Amino acid sequence: VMGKRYVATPQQSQWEMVVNTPLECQLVHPIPSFGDAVFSSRANKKINLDFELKMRRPMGETRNVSLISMPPPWRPGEHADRITNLKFFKQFDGYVGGQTAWGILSELEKGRYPTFSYQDWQSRDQRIEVALSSVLFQNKYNAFSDCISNLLKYSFEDIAFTILHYERQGDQLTKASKKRLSQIADYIRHNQDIDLVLVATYSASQSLSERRAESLRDYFQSLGLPEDRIQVQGYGRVVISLGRTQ
């Protein structure tokens, strides 16, 4: 028997894309009284998706948690009907990632209501659930997917790059070195909490270096961001090396 079940009221299930970027797609569903069910995916080489049950009022050690499906806005009926089992967690801490997370999705679209079964409070008692309605889900999911498809296929897989100019003469950038720049610019721009650091560790020349540094300073001043994300640290190739930022 169930005592408490957080689920949103059939109408009131709002699904929102809180984040739509070539960097991270985040789909949210507030749980009517429990908290939010957040879905995230970020720019990376391999496809990814982690789910996070963002509790708003805590409980703090949840053991033997189960995952399943069932549309409840309706009347007298059984749960037994067709209750697909998704997974069991000896220990659940509000997180999920991988195929499991893709499940919760696969379900929701099917119309089903993924729900987390808890036996936390008191000891022996009714099941205190937490479900996610699949009301609007679909509209937004289609937005979620699109967002994922346009997700950059790389992460901080460009934290430190060494540009290789050709003919050695210096000033002319290679075909690739140019492909690595835009690449590095296509990221940078959508994340303005990260900055550029032009590194010349130092046979080249001071004359070359300088006009060779200006080149990117423009190359980037052209693309989008300005005069401050660029820092040209001197100490001992014009090697771009970005550190996080902060």
Side-chain angles (χ1 to χ4, degrees), residues 85-97:
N85 263 68
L86 261 7
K87 158 160 238 170
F88 187 82
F89 299 104
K90 300 183 198 195
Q91 179 71 240
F92 189 58
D93 64 332
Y95 180 87
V96 186

Side-chain angles (χ1 to χ4, degrees), residues 41-58:
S41 197
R42 315 196 173 62
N44 184 271
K45 286 192 313 264
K46 217 168 79 184
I47 324 88
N48 49 111
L49 164 104
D50 47 61
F51 174 78
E52 200 174 345
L53 200 64
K54 253 160 190 131
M55 301 179 232
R56 167 188 111 181
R57 61 184 196 288

Side-chain angles (χ1 to χ4, degrees), residues 4 18 38 228:
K4 339 170 139 188
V18 192
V38 187
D228 66 349

Side-chain angles (χ1 to χ4, degrees), residues 5 10 42 48 65 100 124 126 142 145 163 178 216-217 225:
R5 157 144 99 240
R42 315 196 173 62
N48 49 111
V65 182
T100 321
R124 77 81 161 297
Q126 336 292 183
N142 292 289
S145 253
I163 36 191
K178 252 121 32 154
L216 350 186
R217 227 175 116 266
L225 82 191

Side-chain angles (χ1 to χ4, degrees), residues 56-77:
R56 167 188 111 181
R57 61 184 196 288
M59 312 119 114
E61 210 79 88
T62 28
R63 303 141 294 158
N64 297 181
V65 182
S66 222
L67 240 198
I68 29 130
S69 32
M70 2 80 81
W74 59 222
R75 307 33 185 180

